[PDB]
């Protein structure tokens, strides 16, 4: 996936805004479709006649692998655009960070 | 997380569904909450100064292990369900599956 939360409420320059889209654009292009044929072969287990535990797992780690490189691709990414903000706007871009962490924290906004 | 198609327009008895939520209750009962400590490590790391991709893929590795925990044991009460499933069900459920994997490999759908 590519969706992040990360530059929400920024507000940017149209130079900032068009280097970012190219930044994305290519990021996208750079990131393979869903290996539909993993989740062929995890469904396949998950309904399998004897349920292997074990063949799930190595499935699952199977799949992690592809995540991990698609994170550190993404991170790489979002760091790069990030570096285009100046020192005020990365200020505002993490204050919002910290306020959505807050959420995870904060019983009460779930009651 | 714990949302699935998996089971998405099967018609389920009453006690079927019911044996389902208890199921999905308990499963969700057991799945600790957004690991917020790792999401802010991770940000950390996308915005340092010296951004540092070892460290990025370091910590991307660390998450996968517990998206990995997660996406077993899902698979586990999954397969449960699915044999609360008669085979009329199951051929159902599986017949679904099939056409929505058909639709990551069917292009004119995404014209």
Redesign the interface.
């Known amino acids: 996936s590519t969706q992040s939360h990360?530059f929400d409420g920024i507000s940017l320059t149209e130079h900032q805004r068009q280097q970012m889209r190219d930044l994305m654009q290519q990021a996208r292009h750079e990131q393979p479709?869903?290996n539909?044929s993993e989740?062929?072969t995890?469904?396949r287990?998950?309904?399998?006649e004897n349920?292997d535990?074990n063949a799930?797992?190595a499935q699952?780690?199977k799949?992690?692998?592809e995540?991990?490189a698609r994170?550190?691709e993404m991170?790489?990414v979002?760091?790069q655009m990030?570096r285009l903000l100046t020192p005020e706007q990365?200020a505002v871009?993490?204050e919002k960070?910290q306020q959505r962490?807050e959420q995870?924290?904060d019983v009460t906004q779930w009651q």
């Open positions: 990360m479709p869903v539909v989740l062929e995890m469904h287990l998950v309904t399998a349920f535990e799930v797992r699952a780690e799949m992690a692998n995540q991990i994170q550190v991170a790489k979002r760091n990030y990365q871009l993490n960070h962490m995870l924290r």
